[PDB]
Amino acid sequence: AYTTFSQTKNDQLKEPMFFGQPVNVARYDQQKYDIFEKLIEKQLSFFWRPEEVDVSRDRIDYQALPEHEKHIFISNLKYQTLLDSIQGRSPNVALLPLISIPELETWVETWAFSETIHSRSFTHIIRNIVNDPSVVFDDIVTNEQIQKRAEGISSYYDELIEMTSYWHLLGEGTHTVNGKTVTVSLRELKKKLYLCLMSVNALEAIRAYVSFACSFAFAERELMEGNAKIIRLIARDEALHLTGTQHMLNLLRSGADDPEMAEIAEECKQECYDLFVQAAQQEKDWADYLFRDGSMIGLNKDILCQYVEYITNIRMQAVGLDLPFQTRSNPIPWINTWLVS
Amino acid sequence: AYTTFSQTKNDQLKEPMFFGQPVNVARYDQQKYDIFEKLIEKQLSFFWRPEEVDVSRDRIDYQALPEHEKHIFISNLKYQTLLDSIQGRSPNVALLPLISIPELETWVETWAFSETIHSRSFTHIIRNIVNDPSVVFDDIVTNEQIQKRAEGISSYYDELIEMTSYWHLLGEGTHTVNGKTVTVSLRELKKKLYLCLMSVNALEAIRAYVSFACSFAFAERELMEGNAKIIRLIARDEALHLTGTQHMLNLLRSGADDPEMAEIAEECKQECYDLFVQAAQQEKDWADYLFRDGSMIGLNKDILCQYVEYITNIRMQAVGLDLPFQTRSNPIPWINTWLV
Ligand SMILES: [Fe+2]
Ligand SMILES: [Fe+2]
Ligand SMILES: [Fe+2]
Ligand SMILES: [Fe+2]
Ligand SMILES: [Hg+2]
Ligand SMILES: [Hg+2]
Ligand SMILES: [Hg+2]
Ligand SMILES: [Hg+2]
Ligand SMILES: [Hg+2]
Ligand SMILES: [Hg+2]
Ligand SMILES: [Hg+2]
Ligand SMILES: [Hg+2]
Ligand SMILES: [Hg+2]
Ligand SMILES: [Hg+2]
Ligand SMILES: [Hg+2]
Ligand SMILES: [Hg+2]
């Protein structure tokens, strides 16, 4: 029920962001919500090439670092590599099949494309600070701790994709597949979408930022400055990605785009609160692990867990969820020097 | 069965290009086929912004243009806009879910992305030469000839996507869905992907270059210089895209990748040939519409057909197919200057 070019003439300004008629013509002269055109323009103006960044002196730095500090650094780099590996492909695979307005379609493709640049940057860093990159890469997939913190990310995406396939194939209704009954509900799919967007928002809004803090702590000590420069470019991209999902979510819950989604958001609002808190919880558990055999000069588990709570409150506030933590001021205002956004 | 991050630690170097274990880690320190890494690097080095190109004079040139020359130019532009609209999303929706090596995955996403830039360049051009671009964009969907010339593109993609979904949901075998039998054969799926690739190769190798010739015809007459700069940047990208599909296809037929693909490429040779022949015939028939209000000096149906046969022969020989047309020299050698 999906087509790469819907032959029906439709007003793209009147379609919902999702589940409407698949986008046929890709035009940018007009838009239902110009936030997406704006984001595309900004992301294109930020285009950068990891290769052009010199990380030459990061090798001696990483080598001179205390063992436990190497752990903190490489562990964080590995998780970041995981995040962008998924973000490079997922928005395309998961969202393109459901988008019904061209600006959002293009935004998603541009967003995903920018994530592949991020992935490319990590290979650039790893290659210049370690002799055998394979060691690093072949420890991301099985790393028990990394799967633990990354828990739930792929699942949300995968269930959305599966429901989407059933929806496009069988359509709305009650069906039979090899003796088993399979119910396909649009309302359920919409919920799956919403939960998935919330999860991606938490990924780019908090998970990425916690890793930035870990990375810039070294930059503060004039260490791993090659990596620092690259992470600064990535955080600038992430600021945009974050804005994109916040708008998607706020537009979906406000009821202007799809009344039914507005209803759905309200009722699973508590589920969303829980998934957000769980994400922050995983970040905390990770922190506890990062500094088990040694804290870092300028960043320890305590300060880091404070930051998680601090940014979590802000992000959740931005998408209409209650604040789970105690309000406080930024525990690490020095981070602002590196977050040009 | 599809996952955005497969938990199995696998040797990405031993996976086949398609249908293997979905890619988990996106690494670029190694590759089974360095050709895709090379294509990514080159495409990234070619990054350009459409709007950055000055198309100010084009409005005047276009307005001053004879009415039938406007039609030729715009009809060509509308088709190009359609191809890039499809090529911006399709490679990602149809191929991404089936790729099993990182370099190819990122290449497809980079390739698809470069297409949205092409699409954006058309909006840039349109919005700058006509008072209301909505009068151009709207007809793209309903224009019968357009739908007739591009006929068959979305079909291949859509059929591949549907079969892929059945595969990821049910896996191989003979299943029962709503009291009906649905067979899911991986071999049959490989055939679909293979013919889909051959078809994209025909689109970017022939359909695109035919449109370039029309655009550049005006360039030689010192008209629409802004459009030509843009078309000259697009063609540069497209040369990488076609190089990319030619390599996917040739690598599959070599047997060096998935053995079954090599056999399938062998069994489907006539289909191969037939779709190139048909795509060529469609380009010719489009001429009858492109020159309804009359042709122009240096660009007519006769020359269009000659070019089509000429370029098709070259493209088909590049992927090991027999040449259907009589041999001939380039009917428009002046295009070589704009193609680089
Ligand atoms: Fe990223
Ligand atoms: Fe991101
Ligand atoms: Fe293109
Ligand atoms: Fe292309
Ligand atoms: Hg999502
Ligand atoms: Hg998700
Ligand atoms: Hg750190
Ligand atoms: Hg941190
Ligand atoms: Hg780090
Ligand atoms: Hg929710
Ligand atoms: Hg295709
Ligand atoms: Hg294809
Ligand atoms: Hg195609
Ligand atoms: Hg032509
Ligand atoms: Hg063939
Ligand atoms: Hg073929």
XYZ file of C-alpha atoms and ligand atoms in Angstrom:
697
model
C 0.000 0.000 0.000
C 3.150 2.112 -0.162
C 4.316 3.728 -3.391
C 7.468 5.591 -4.370
C 5.252 7.964 -6.360
C 1.554 8.382 -5.620
C -0.141 9.206 -8.924
C -2.978 11.049 -7.151
C -2.874 14.842 -7.332
C -2.997 16.011 -3.727
C -2.507 19.261 -1.817
C 0.711 18.569 0.098
C -0.113 21.505 2.368
C -3.211 19.681 3.629
C -1.675 16.279 4.373
C -0.779 15.234 7.923
C 2.916 14.794 8.710
C 2.421 11.024 8.808
C 0.069 8.325 7.519
C -1.333 10.543 4.779
C -0.801 9.968 1.057
C 2.803 9.019 0.255
C 4.739 12.048 -1.055
C 4.991 12.166 -4.834
C 6.659 15.397 -5.991
C 9.521 16.802 -3.920
C 9.062 20.586 -3.872
C 10.499 23.169 -1.486
C 8.773 26.339 -2.720
C 6.109 25.904 -0.044
C 5.523 23.982 3.182
C 2.813 23.165 5.707
C 5.290 23.613 8.573
C 8.340 25.644 7.561
C 10.308 24.449 10.594
C 11.422 21.481 8.484
C 12.540 23.574 5.507
C 14.441 25.774 7.940
C 16.118 22.742 9.474
C 17.144 21.388 6.051
C 18.699 24.730 5.149
C 20.584 24.957 8.437
C 21.864 21.380 8.285
C 23.112 21.945 4.719
C 24.925 25.116 5.817
C 26.643 23.121 8.587
C 28.018 20.449 6.219
C 31.477 19.344 7.314
C 34.022 16.595 6.563
C 35.551 14.688 9.519
C 38.654 14.113 7.425
C 39.381 17.857 7.358
C 39.796 17.810 11.143
C 43.293 17.103 12.445
C 43.304 14.513 15.228
C 47.032 13.860 14.817
C 47.964 14.790 18.393
C 45.086 12.881 19.993
C 47.153 9.683 19.853
C 49.888 10.726 22.308
C 47.162 12.236 24.505
C 45.147 9.022 24.614
C 48.323 7.016 25.203
C 49.530 9.253 28.041
C 46.107 9.090 29.721
C 45.703 7.010 32.897
C 44.267 3.565 32.220
C 40.899 4.333 33.854
C 40.705 7.592 31.893
C 41.328 5.718 28.629
C 38.394 3.507 29.604
C 36.101 6.474 30.177
C 37.084 7.987 26.829
C 36.945 4.887 24.663
C 33.777 3.624 26.380
C 32.017 6.888 25.615
C 33.341 6.994 22.032
C 32.036 3.444 21.502
C 28.562 4.363 22.713
C 28.490 7.462 20.509
C 29.509 5.275 17.544
C 26.597 2.986 18.415
C 24.114 5.880 18.560
C 25.055 7.236 15.146
C 25.255 3.786 13.568
C 21.548 3.423 14.382
C 20.633 7.046 13.640
C 22.258 6.846 10.239
C 19.818 4.224 8.965
C 16.798 4.240 11.247
C 15.076 7.556 10.573
C 15.024 6.572 6.875
C 13.933 2.973 7.309
C 11.389 3.812 10.002
C 9.975 7.205 9.033
C 10.155 7.538 5.232
C 7.506 4.845 4.678
C 5.066 6.909 6.769
C 5.736 10.559 5.851
C 3.154 12.424 3.770
C 4.624 15.938 3.365
C 7.826 16.590 1.306
C 9.631 18.962 3.677
C 9.495 16.396 6.476
C 10.546 13.664 4.031
C 13.593 15.621 2.933
C 14.385 16.671 6.481
C 14.449 13.036 7.587
C 16.794 12.139 4.696
C 19.088 15.103 5.421
C 19.031 14.349 9.159
C 19.961 10.683 8.533
C 22.613 11.725 6.030
C 24.192 13.997 8.650
C 24.290 11.016 11.004
C 26.413 9.038 8.494
C 28.910 11.918 8.590
C 28.988 11.512 12.362
C 29.680 7.763 11.972
C 32.422 8.605 9.490
C 33.955 11.018 12.008
C 34.232 8.280 14.664
C 36.138 6.016 12.305
C 38.413 9.004 11.688
C 39.045 9.422 15.428
C 39.427 5.712 16.198
C 41.878 5.225 13.328
C 44.085 8.013 14.682
C 44.177 7.066 18.364
C 44.410 3.276 18.180
C 46.556 0.832 16.212
C 43.855 -1.726 15.455
C 40.409 -0.107 14.984
C 38.853 -3.580 14.840
C 39.362 -3.952 18.574
C 37.173 -0.892 19.179
C 34.475 -1.628 16.579
C 34.184 -5.338 17.396
C 33.442 -4.457 21.033
C 30.421 -2.244 20.397
C 28.027 -4.986 19.283
C 28.664 -7.366 22.212
C 29.690 -4.905 24.936
C 27.274 -5.902 27.701
C 27.409 -2.414 29.225
C 26.768 -0.646 25.930
C 23.769 -2.828 25.041
C 22.518 -2.098 28.549
C 22.614 1.681 28.134
C 21.409 1.441 24.522
C 18.499 -0.683 25.715
C 15.163 0.000 24.073
C 16.428 2.141 21.205
C 16.414 -0.485 18.464
C 13.274 -2.126 19.892
C 11.105 0.961 19.474
C 12.309 1.372 15.891
C 11.943 -2.339 15.049
C 8.350 -2.616 16.316
C 7.331 0.515 14.444
C 8.826 -0.926 11.232
C 7.114 -4.286 11.700
C 3.692 -2.749 12.400
C 4.255 -0.483 9.392
C 4.925 -3.507 7.166
C 1.780 -5.269 8.383
C -0.176 -2.041 7.892
C 1.040 -1.460 4.321
C 0.567 -5.134 3.450
C -2.734 -6.138 5.088
C -4.237 -2.776 5.986
C -6.662 -1.972 8.799
C -8.445 -5.014 10.230
C -8.337 -8.486 11.749
C -6.418 -11.010 9.642
C -4.990 -14.530 9.717
C -1.362 -15.414 9.112
C -0.442 -19.089 9.203
C -3.234 -19.992 11.620
C -2.586 -17.025 13.894
C -4.821 -13.967 14.128
C -3.124 -10.640 13.441
C -4.882 -7.381 14.310
C -3.827 -4.246 12.454
C -4.926 -0.985 14.015
C -3.982 2.485 12.787
C -4.433 3.869 16.299
C -1.902 1.350 17.571
C 0.544 2.199 14.768
C 0.233 5.909 15.599
C 1.019 5.153 19.221
C 4.043 3.082 18.105
C 5.187 6.072 16.063
C 4.753 8.492 18.966
C 6.624 6.286 21.418
C 9.394 5.889 18.839
C 9.735 9.649 18.302
C 9.822 10.238 22.049
C 12.573 7.642 22.329
C 14.601 9.310 19.542
C 14.056 12.682 21.212
C 15.493 11.289 24.467
C 18.369 9.757 22.478
C 19.379 13.053 20.872
C 18.247 15.249 23.764
C 19.923 13.454 26.669
C 21.950 10.386 25.688
C 24.041 12.348 23.196
C 24.537 15.284 25.583
C 25.732 13.092 28.433
C 28.376 11.739 26.037
C 29.307 15.293 24.953
C 30.034 16.181 28.595
C 32.281 13.153 28.912
C 34.111 14.253 25.699
C 34.456 17.946 26.533
C 35.803 17.215 30.038
C 39.004 16.136 28.282
C 38.947 19.226 26.053
C 38.746 21.369 29.190
C 42.068 19.809 30.171
C 43.397 20.536 26.690
C 43.390 16.786 25.968
C 41.886 14.925 23.000
C 41.412 18.259 21.208
C 41.053 16.597 17.841
C 38.100 14.616 19.161
C 36.860 17.788 20.892
C 36.600 19.684 17.592
C 34.676 16.839 15.978
C 32.266 16.494 18.892
C 31.638 20.219 18.771
C 30.536 19.908 15.108
C 28.351 16.916 16.002
C 26.676 18.693 18.930
C 25.825 21.550 16.584
C 24.124 19.000 14.288
C 22.390 17.334 17.226
C 20.932 20.663 18.355
C 19.083 20.687 15.002
C 18.040 17.019 15.146
C 16.634 17.652 18.617
C 14.635 20.666 17.432
C 13.224 18.550 14.627
C 11.826 15.837 16.919
C 10.580 18.298 19.553
C 8.518 20.007 16.825
C 7.326 16.678 15.455
C 6.186 15.633 18.944
C 4.684 18.985 19.940
C 2.819 19.167 16.616
C 1.521 15.624 17.070
C 0.298 16.193 20.633
C -1.200 19.662 20.108
C -3.860 18.195 17.815
C -3.375 20.625 14.922
C -1.881 17.987 12.624
C -3.817 14.862 13.607
C -6.652 15.024 16.191
C -6.406 11.279 16.804
C -2.683 11.516 17.591
C -3.509 14.319 20.032
C -5.742 11.851 21.866
C -3.123 9.088 21.746
C -0.378 11.277 23.199
C -2.438 12.198 26.243
C -3.284 8.645 27.284
C 0.218 7.210 26.861
C 1.679 10.379 28.378
C 2.616 8.424 31.506
C 4.255 5.722 29.402
C 6.330 8.462 27.741
C 7.281 9.902 31.097
C 8.420 6.412 32.077
C 10.464 5.781 28.950
C 12.166 9.163 29.391
C 12.954 8.485 33.040
C 14.188 5.010 32.129
C 16.527 6.507 29.532
C 17.958 8.901 32.124
C 18.245 5.953 34.502
C 20.287 3.967 31.990
C 22.596 6.945 31.551
C 23.080 7.052 35.317
C 23.808 3.316 35.536
C 26.300 3.796 32.732
C 27.989 6.637 34.617
C 28.322 4.416 37.678
C 30.195 2.011 35.405
C 32.307 4.598 33.584
C 34.008 5.692 36.816
C 34.023 2.419 38.760
C 37.789 1.905 38.697
C 38.572 5.611 38.810
C 36.811 8.952 38.455
C 38.026 11.708 36.153
C 39.635 15.078 36.776
C 36.674 17.406 36.357
C 33.953 14.808 35.940
C 32.833 12.085 38.334
C 29.717 9.938 38.577
C 28.084 12.372 41.004
C 28.511 15.463 38.828
C 27.577 13.476 35.745
C 24.387 12.107 37.320
C 23.526 15.685 38.292
C 23.902 16.708 34.653
C 21.648 13.864 33.485
C 18.924 15.086 35.852
C 19.522 18.704 34.835
C 19.197 18.173 31.062
C 16.498 15.543 31.459
C 14.270 18.078 33.230
C 14.774 20.572 30.404
C 14.115 18.116 27.575
C 11.032 16.524 29.162
C 9.700 20.012 29.836
C 10.150 20.800 26.125
C 7.792 17.992 25.073
C 5.203 18.527 27.807
C 6.180 15.842 30.310
C 6.301 16.422 34.068
C 9.705 17.027 35.603
C 10.981 13.853 37.312
C 13.879 15.486 39.125
C 14.699 18.316 41.505
C 15.283 21.566 39.670
C 18.796 22.969 39.913
C 21.131 25.120 37.850
C 23.544 23.595 35.354
C 26.076 21.596 37.412
C 28.723 22.039 34.698
C 28.334 25.524 33.135
C 31.758 25.061 31.509
C 30.061 22.708 29.039
C 28.537 25.826 27.486
C 31.879 26.808 25.994
C 31.635 23.758 23.721
C 27.933 23.787 22.933
C 27.950 26.626 20.409
C 24.196 26.065 20.226
C 13.220 -10.280 11.023
C 14.589 -6.826 10.208
C 16.466 -4.959 12.920
C 18.014 -1.495 13.153
C 20.878 -3.042 15.115
C 21.543 -6.770 14.828
C 22.986 -8.144 18.081
C 25.137 -10.788 16.402
C 28.827 -9.897 16.166
C 29.500 -10.629 12.499
C 32.385 -10.246 10.065
C 30.977 -7.524 7.808
C 33.731 -8.399 5.336
C 32.147 -11.777 4.654
C 28.544 -10.606 4.295
C 27.035 -10.346 0.786
C 26.035 -6.891 -0.466
C 22.349 -7.769 -0.062
C 20.174 -10.062 2.034
C 22.843 -10.800 4.614
C 22.693 -9.804 8.272
C 21.459 -6.222 8.608
C 24.379 -3.881 9.294
C 24.938 -3.055 12.963
C 28.096 -0.977 13.367
C 28.760 1.686 10.758
C 32.523 1.476 10.340
C 34.629 2.783 7.452
C 38.136 1.600 8.381
C 37.640 -1.470 6.209
C 35.427 -2.561 3.321
C 34.664 -5.667 1.278
C 34.414 -3.465 -1.817
C 36.384 -0.235 -1.562
C 34.574 1.072 -4.620
C 31.642 2.148 -2.423
C 33.902 3.953 0.064
C 35.517 5.702 -2.901
C 32.122 6.773 -4.231
C 31.114 8.156 -0.808
C 34.350 10.136 -0.557
C 33.966 11.547 -4.054
C 30.291 12.441 -3.625
C 31.088 14.204 -0.336
C 33.845 16.180 -2.063
C 31.273 17.288 -4.645
C 28.817 18.706 -2.099
C 27.103 21.802 -3.523
C 24.173 24.060 -2.622
C 21.675 24.756 -5.459
C 20.596 28.140 -4.110
C 24.249 29.214 -4.090
C 24.024 29.158 -7.898
C 22.957 32.370 -9.645
C 19.963 31.829 -11.934
C 19.052 35.526 -12.165
C 19.543 35.876 -15.922
C 17.638 32.645 -16.641
C 14.291 34.332 -15.926
C 14.912 36.884 -18.663
C 16.352 34.322 -21.095
C 13.362 32.059 -20.452
C 10.776 34.823 -20.827
C 12.449 36.068 -24.008
C 12.332 32.463 -25.236
C 9.900 31.449 -28.023
C 6.786 29.789 -26.572
C 7.567 26.372 -28.051
C 11.127 26.569 -26.735
C 9.698 27.296 -23.296
C 7.654 24.094 -23.604
C 10.659 22.008 -24.622
C 12.749 23.395 -21.765
C 10.072 23.132 -19.085
C 8.744 19.723 -20.173
C 12.305 18.452 -19.788
C 12.655 20.140 -16.400
C 9.412 18.638 -15.102
C 10.528 15.104 -15.982
C 13.892 15.654 -14.301
C 12.058 16.877 -11.192
C 10.032 13.659 -11.185
C 13.056 11.373 -11.534
C 14.874 13.048 -8.638
C 11.723 13.068 -6.531
C 11.662 9.261 -6.878
C 15.427 8.798 -6.594
C 15.562 10.842 -3.397
C 13.374 8.424 -1.413
C 13.417 5.062 -3.230
C 17.042 3.964 -2.793
C 16.492 4.363 0.977
C 13.054 2.767 1.185
C 13.786 -0.102 -1.214
C 17.490 -0.856 -0.761
C 18.409 0.131 2.782
C 16.371 -2.700 4.351
C 18.251 -5.278 2.255
C 21.875 -4.119 2.508
C 24.285 -6.130 4.635
C 27.628 -4.295 4.361
C 28.332 -0.833 5.878
C 30.039 0.823 2.899
C 27.119 0.064 0.578
C 24.577 1.127 3.194
C 26.204 4.534 3.610
C 26.671 4.826 -0.150
C 22.944 4.363 -0.754
C 22.108 6.986 1.905
C 24.690 9.397 0.470
C 23.437 8.671 -3.036
C 19.815 9.221 -2.019
C 20.783 12.414 -0.192
C 22.538 13.866 -3.235
C 19.244 13.314 -5.100
C 17.301 15.541 -2.702
C 19.856 18.234 -3.469
C 19.050 17.745 -7.161
C 15.353 18.048 -6.343
C 16.069 21.217 -4.397
C 17.963 22.644 -7.387
C 14.869 22.218 -9.561
C 12.721 24.177 -7.094
C 15.445 26.819 -7.144
C 15.348 26.932 -10.945
C 11.569 26.743 -11.234
C 10.774 29.386 -8.607
C 13.186 31.713 -10.422
C 11.851 31.557 -13.974
C 8.069 31.179 -13.663
C 5.713 33.419 -11.684
C 3.974 30.418 -10.122
C 5.914 27.140 -9.720
C 2.700 25.448 -8.573
C 1.736 25.473 -12.250
C 4.802 23.340 -12.915
C 4.800 21.009 -9.916
C 1.098 20.134 -10.149
C 1.280 18.936 -13.765
C 4.184 16.620 -12.987
C 1.768 14.201 -11.329
C -1.053 14.397 -13.896
C 0.891 14.921 -17.122
C 0.016 11.774 -19.086
C 3.160 11.859 -21.222
C 5.285 12.287 -18.101
C 3.520 9.327 -16.479
C 4.066 7.494 -19.764
C 7.787 8.236 -20.127
C 8.568 7.481 -16.471
C 6.172 4.543 -16.604
C 7.689 1.534 -14.866
C 9.953 3.209 -12.303
C 7.776 3.323 -9.200
C 6.426 -0.115 -10.157
C 9.749 -1.910 -9.807
C 10.499 -0.144 -6.533
C 7.048 -0.751 -5.075
C 7.003 -4.451 -5.989
C 10.422 -4.922 -4.386
C 9.306 -3.156 -1.203
C 6.157 -5.278 -0.890
C 8.045 -8.549 -1.375
C 10.720 -7.398 1.055
C 8.065 -6.783 3.711
C 6.627 -10.259 3.241
C 10.162 -11.612 3.542
C 10.995 -9.760 6.767
C 7.614 -10.641 8.283
C 7.147 -14.242 7.179
C 10.539 -15.401 5.975
C 10.920 -18.039 3.280
C 8.259 -20.614 2.589
C 4.678 -21.110 1.463
C 2.402 -19.237 3.847
C -1.310 -18.644 4.309
C -2.561 -15.049 4.616
C -6.291 -14.361 4.946
C -7.201 -17.744 3.503
C -4.785 -17.249 0.620
C -1.413 -18.734 -0.252
C 1.527 -16.355 -0.324
C 4.870 -17.721 -1.389
C 8.031 -16.056 -0.162
C 11.107 -17.154 -2.067
C 14.412 -15.435 -1.360
C 15.582 -16.413 -4.842
C 12.540 -14.675 -6.317
C 13.290 -11.656 -4.119
C 16.874 -11.565 -5.358
C 15.482 -11.513 -8.926
C 13.304 -8.512 -8.037
C 16.224 -6.633 -6.493
C 18.481 -7.515 -9.407
C 15.997 -6.246 -12.007
C 15.283 -3.222 -9.857
C 19.016 -2.369 -9.947
C 19.246 -2.899 -13.714
C 16.274 -0.541 -14.020
C 17.859 2.215 -11.873
C 20.991 1.821 -13.960
C 18.880 2.465 -17.074
C 17.253 5.500 -15.443
C 20.486 7.230 -14.449
C 22.504 6.117 -17.475
C 19.988 6.880 -20.180
C 16.926 8.808 -19.017
C 19.113 11.361 -17.205
C 21.658 11.953 -19.990
C 18.873 12.456 -22.503
C 17.497 15.205 -20.277
C 20.999 16.703 -19.909
C 21.309 16.990 -23.704
C 18.051 18.946 -23.885
C 19.152 21.319 -21.104
C 22.608 21.825 -22.603
C 21.208 22.516 -26.066
C 20.085 25.869 -24.660
C 23.483 26.301 -23.035
C 25.235 26.080 -26.412
C 22.869 28.757 -27.748
C 24.143 30.845 -24.815
C 20.756 30.667 -23.087
C 19.777 29.475 -19.586
C 23.313 29.676 -18.228
C 22.234 29.279 -14.615
C 20.377 26.063 -15.369
C 23.441 24.769 -17.215
C 25.693 25.365 -14.189
C 23.235 23.367 -12.090
C 22.771 20.663 -14.709
C 26.564 20.513 -14.945
C 26.756 19.790 -11.203
C 23.937 17.215 -11.342
C 25.558 15.272 -14.214
C 28.767 15.177 -12.172
C 26.859 13.440 -9.364
C 24.954 11.160 -11.622
C 28.259 9.932 -13.164
C 29.041 8.542 -9.670
C 25.554 7.091 -9.226
C 25.678 5.214 -12.507
C 29.217 4.066 -11.719
C 27.768 2.783 -8.464
C 24.972 0.702 -9.996
C 27.243 -0.573 -12.785
C 29.594 -1.905 -10.105
C 26.812 -3.410 -7.999
C 25.515 -5.185 -11.093
C 28.885 -6.331 -12.417
C 30.014 -7.494 -8.959
C 26.818 -9.535 -8.577
C 27.294 -11.178 -11.970
C 30.963 -11.913 -11.308
C 30.058 -14.518 -8.706
C 32.493 -12.850 -6.299
C 29.606 -11.902 -4.021
C 26.486 -14.031 -3.583
C 26.817 -17.110 -5.890
C 23.068 -17.287 -6.431
C 23.076 -13.693 -7.717
C 25.563 -14.695 -10.392
C 23.190 -17.450 -11.550
C 20.199 -15.112 -11.428
C 22.030 -12.447 -13.396
C 22.610 -15.159 -15.983
C 18.999 -16.346 -16.107
C 17.612 -12.816 -16.307
C 19.835 -11.586 -19.182
C 16.911 -11.254 -21.598
C 14.830 -9.338 -19.029
C 17.906 -7.156 -18.600
C 18.043 -6.516 -22.308
C 14.285 -6.064 -22.663
C 14.008 -3.367 -20.026
C 16.871 -1.374 -21.575
C 15.190 -1.702 -24.973
C 11.874 -0.536 -23.515
C 13.393 2.349 -21.566
C 15.047 3.477 -24.795
C 11.744 3.276 -26.687
C 10.061 5.372 -24.010
C 12.674 8.108 -24.362
C 12.037 8.183 -28.110
C 8.253 8.397 -27.726
C 8.729 11.279 -25.300
C 10.186 13.247 -28.214
C 6.792 13.343 -29.903
C 5.552 15.349 -26.913
C 8.721 17.348 -26.291
C 8.457 18.699 -29.842
C 4.677 18.985 -30.264
C 4.774 22.780 -30.579
C 7.756 22.280 -32.860
C 11.456 21.644 -32.337
C 14.462 23.943 -32.458
C 17.694 24.162 -34.426
C 20.165 21.596 -33.125
C 17.511 19.761 -31.130
C 14.739 17.687 -32.682
C 13.143 14.259 -32.481
C 15.546 12.896 -35.085
C 18.641 13.943 -33.099
C 17.038 12.875 -29.813
C 16.454 9.346 -31.113
C 19.976 9.165 -32.523
C 21.442 10.181 -29.181
C 19.250 7.690 -27.331
C 20.442 4.733 -29.415
C 24.016 5.966 -29.094
C 24.049 6.279 -25.301
C 21.998 3.109 -24.696
C 24.532 1.006 -26.630
C 27.324 2.426 -24.441
C 25.419 1.883 -21.202
C 24.357 -1.680 -22.081
C 27.879 -2.720 -23.052
C 29.048 -1.370 -19.673
C 27.038 -4.056 -17.867
C 27.705 -6.896 -20.329
C 24.555 -6.804 -22.469
C 24.236 -7.090 -26.254
C 23.840 -3.840 -28.216
C 20.354 -3.544 -29.732
C 21.039 -0.505 -31.938
C 23.226 0.094 -34.977
C 26.653 1.440 -34.058
C 27.170 5.171 -34.565
C 29.250 8.154 -33.517
C 28.054 10.705 -31.001
C 25.289 12.693 -32.786
C 25.957 15.644 -30.473
C 29.708 15.677 -29.650
C 29.313 19.206 -28.269
C 27.746 17.660 -25.174
C 31.180 16.309 -24.207
C 32.181 19.821 -23.131
C 29.397 20.081 -20.545
C 29.700 16.487 -19.333
C 33.406 16.525 -18.441
Fe 24.568 12.011 15.288
Fe 21.450 13.049 15.649
Fe 19.522 13.250 -9.482
Fe 21.208 9.852 -9.601
Hg 11.559 6.759 15.774
Hg 12.562 4.983 17.865
Hg 34.801 11.664 30.323
Hg 29.198 12.669 31.078
Hg 34.497 10.902 25.065
Hg 3.339 8.235 24.912
Hg 13.964 -0.105 -9.236
Hg 16.361 -0.351 -7.407
Hg 14.267 2.343 -11.198
Hg 17.468 15.692 -25.480
Hg 21.759 -9.162 -16.872
Hg 19.500 -8.364 -16.330
